[PDB]
Symmetry: D3
Subunit: 250 residues, 6 copies
């Protein structure tokens, strides 16, 4: 391999310069299957990589795992291999009452509640998305009639205390995160997830283009028993949106 | 007056909800005169306010003075009077070799080298522009033929040490800022100015829309004797862009 | 002009080494008019400058605008022109019940709730006034029988959230400033204003002498309808005190 | 499943209270096979879990993935299922000249170069190992004849800039981390890895026992072409040590 | 003297490489008297030094005074004279209900609520004890049947506000320390004292071995009138434990 | 005793409200003997206390030991016994070329390179002296003919790395303090010592008056073999000044 972790050579990419980067290794095949000539390249640790073709051009699909540290390894090693544009697709929990399950969120910039972003730029630097990527995601969402919200996301190194969850082993949250969800809500923040602060900071500070889209599967502000069906449909629409955005960025 | 500093009543605004916010009080009349039925409302301290009409709708032009503290007063008191969209117009100095004098810069987000932004949101929150305002500024720049750069700006509470200037009384820069210009250059930052970190943070955290455009009149990386005519033309260029963007946001 | 913003040459100063620096461009003429041979030198942006003569010696009066950033520009450019002593005169709101409207405050040092001070010295460095300037202000206050208080001032980059005001567009204050006024009150702090942290830090860290005096026009701790008359009288006494202090420092 | 990510019920564990936690999901089966009656329980994302029996008692082996965020999910959800002791096993790169490839490292505490540890305790709290777990790991290492070093480890949210690697896409390291490797070397730090600051802080602050052992496969201070056989043998050595330590902690 | 403060020459030590370091100059003679051939060397400021012999080998006993600053002077100057192992003995107040008066505490690492530790290593570095010293203290405690607890200690630059005491001149505690005792209690912290953060950080970052033991004389969580007798007995047992640990470290 | 550490009752003080606070317990008797009817009250740890009479009024002399932690105990327990004015006397090393051995320094405020000051007020609060105490010290210095410097002091929790000394066991200084002495020199700081940041912050934030004077016995910027007689004379000079200042503050 030409890189330390992903198990890829530059020849494997066949000249690709764009990658779609989901979190779950199990979701990579689903995304690749929407495009032409899908081929599995490698599977090592949390990093599963396929290649496919979109309008005659090679594109990469590679999983990051959960969190900024493993995300930073995938993005760096793909950059070493020639990738210059990175599109993240995820699912997410909204923290605003006006945002519904089934909706799509496009992130303009993120609240940096992570550690890895600091290894690229000091805290004062914005975790901001690329303008061309954000534009392509909004236009792709419109092309299939999705209800879309555009704005700021909170990006946390934990699933539990950093998202103010109390249903845990200890049942408590450290002082600095107590009351934090209500503060982000007042400041207009749409949602929580765990990788965008790292992704957006490391790309914007190194001349790489990045964008971020997610489907809403749950809402933290109103109690409701989730419906597995609505949730599956919502992930499928987010995947088509990221693929269509990619088409506009080739 | 209905507000503490600006010397304005809500009746004076005639229902306006958009304001163009330059820094220099002597620039307010020149911007207002490009639109219909311009009238002076007030002048107190660094805050000079005119009203005009664009495509039949009232709009405000109001100066901020230099720095985030006076900016924060103007934005708050305008919001008290009904303004919900804020467009900053300026001229600026570039720190990248590929950006030329006469070019136009549209800011997606800012590095927070200020104090007032912290009084609205903690450092981790992004100083990010509104997507609709950024889109209007970019599309207006293309409509008149400008060469445009879109990206990150460094926003400083000083003109001298925070912009790493050594041609000063002391000729010294505090440790924290020594070597800072070269760091921002490596990270792709386009330019320095002094009000956007405050403006963009206070608006993004309070449900108000803001954007920012500026004309390039000097470049810190290439020695050149300034041309007064070229600099006047560049200012006029940027002002035409901010008025046309306002037209798209009514 | 020999400087970038103020529109002054060194010859304009006629050998002056002391400046009185109020905030409001409109108040500069009032101060100059107490002295001999007053002459207007320049008006650009928030910076209005006059010259006059005190006991046969030239003195400068120059406005700063509101906030540390514009203050830092005026102080630097005046230093480039030969000024070595800076005396600030303002009006202010007290936060202690024993301090009355009509009283005069002389500041020994300031709480650094600003951004520009950090561009001169790290936070651990004290925003302390010059001992000779503080002495001259206290003695000048005694010479006209003013009721005087000497101590610490809190210096904020905002008028609204940083001074814990809730009568605003949003009606809220960021976590770190919630409860802050009561903490400063317990620690003996006399008042809030917006420029002294910057002024005192940048002078004490660069071999320049600075002092600070203000008249009390309002008290945050007891509700009362302000009297425009008492307020005008109080600003007039503070102006005579700063002029008399200057006389003792030539 | 009784937990959100791991895909496990409490019944699956058969009363287990100790878990061995490697990073790589493909290493879970190899560790479990050294013990009696090994069986696969689940595999979801980077989390692969097996059960086995040691001296008649059930034990769990569960992968964390790379970085503190995914580590924090595995540790929390295992604790929800009844686990109270956590033993980390890895391979690593040394930064001291006297430490040789083939040696074993036991960590007493870690330098916190991560984000997730802050979500459990403020920076001032020590990322310290449990004394009983450290004692068992040291005594097990001596029982099989390993050359062992006991001391402090640097635990980083990145593989590249946080470990001061320059052989990258950008070839740059942010100011804060320039010269950092030489500082840690002078302070006696043995090595870099990426999960221990999170693991040790979250356990020490919540009444859970944790320890950490690793085999040295490379040394950053001496150029050497790696030997694949030597590296495989070193991994097997460290795994035998972590199983024997578990035997002492039942 | 060969050093600035302690009044010692290297010859005075007769080849000693281990020191026992209590806080109170008055307690040095008591410790020395348990060993062979005790001799008083010097008394200057808070620094009183004796020499004695343990199993035929010279050992030093030297007081630190109260706090990290004076501790840092004693440790440095003893290191200049050849000392490489440092054992602290103290008395302390427990903050856990299960810990009783009469018990002995051995500290694995400390919460850094001091200033001097930062002059040796940044905050992220752990204030961790040496593994051989901690082992010797635990084994010495067992040899006389003491009830022993092993874990984390909070180490404060103050006796009053930093340990959340309200029975003071002012009757208040600064915001950041309000509620702090209950947070440390929840995180498993055993006790407060005032020198171990400095001692453990400066030794672990400079190749010196250090450990820490204390007798419990009071418990912050249950009201009780202290018994001078139980307190004297408890200090005597801690002194024998430190002497016996030293024997195991020669 | 009415207090925990000092071994004093309120009756012992005979109504005293002013204390002179040297660092060295062996200096307490020498200061007290310059006044009338001197008597020893107590000696415990680094705290030695005498009473004497000045112009018919009782005054206290009490040692602090080295560093802010022991200083904070002495000041708190004296305040509990009725003391409201605190005068620090010391000898010190200058860091400016124009300051000579034999000169006297009066401190207006201090750089906070300590930990204990943070336990009373956040870093942004100024470590500033009382104006009445500073005035008395300056006027007393002039009355006896001393060459006096008035200004800022750097106050450090260490004698060695925090004062950028390299003549040590390790010969290293942590990154944060490398190049620090030259920064403070450029900023006009006169000298280093180790207790004033704590003393001045705790008093200014609690309604207590404090000041500080010191005699210069060495200069870090000019190599010179110290003269023992000159150094003894300089100490006596500073002590005469602090007694005469006390006389003016009764
Ligand atoms: K201004
Ligand atoms: K991961
Ligand atoms: K001490």
């Amino acid at each position: 391999s030409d890189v330390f972790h992903l198990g890829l050579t530059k020849n494997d990419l066949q000249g690709a310069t764009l990658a779609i980067v989901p979190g779950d290794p199990d979701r990579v095949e689903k995304i690749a299957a929407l495009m032409d000539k899908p081929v599995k390249l490698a599977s090592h640790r949390e990093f599963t990589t396929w290649r496919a073709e979109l309008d005659g051009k090679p594109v990469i699909v590679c999983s990051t795992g959960i969190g900024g540290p493993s995300t930073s390894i995938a993005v760096e090693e793909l950059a070493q291999l020639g990738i210059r544009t990175f599109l993240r697709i995820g699912t997410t929990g909204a923290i605003q009452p006006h945002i519904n399950v089934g909706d799509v969120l496009v992130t303009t910039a993120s609240v940096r509640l992570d550690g890895a972003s600091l290894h690229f730029a000091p805290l004062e630097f914005p975790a901001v998305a690329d303008f061309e990527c954000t534009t392509a995601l909004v236009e792709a969402a419109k092309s299939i009639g999705a209800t879309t919200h555009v704005g700021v996301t909170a990006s946390s190194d934990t699933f539990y205390p950093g998202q103010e969850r109390y249903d845990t082993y200890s049942g408590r949250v450290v002082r600095h995160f107590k009351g934090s969800m209500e503060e982000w809500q007042a400041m207009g923040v749409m949602n929580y997830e765990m990788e965008s602060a790292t992704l957006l900071t490391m790309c914007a500070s190194q001349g790489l283009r990045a964008g971020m889209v997610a489907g809403v599967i749950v809402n933290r502000t109103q109690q409701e028993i989730p419906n597995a069906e609505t949730m599956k449909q919502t992930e499928s629409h987010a995947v088509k949106i990221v693929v269509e955005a990619a088409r506009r960025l080739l």
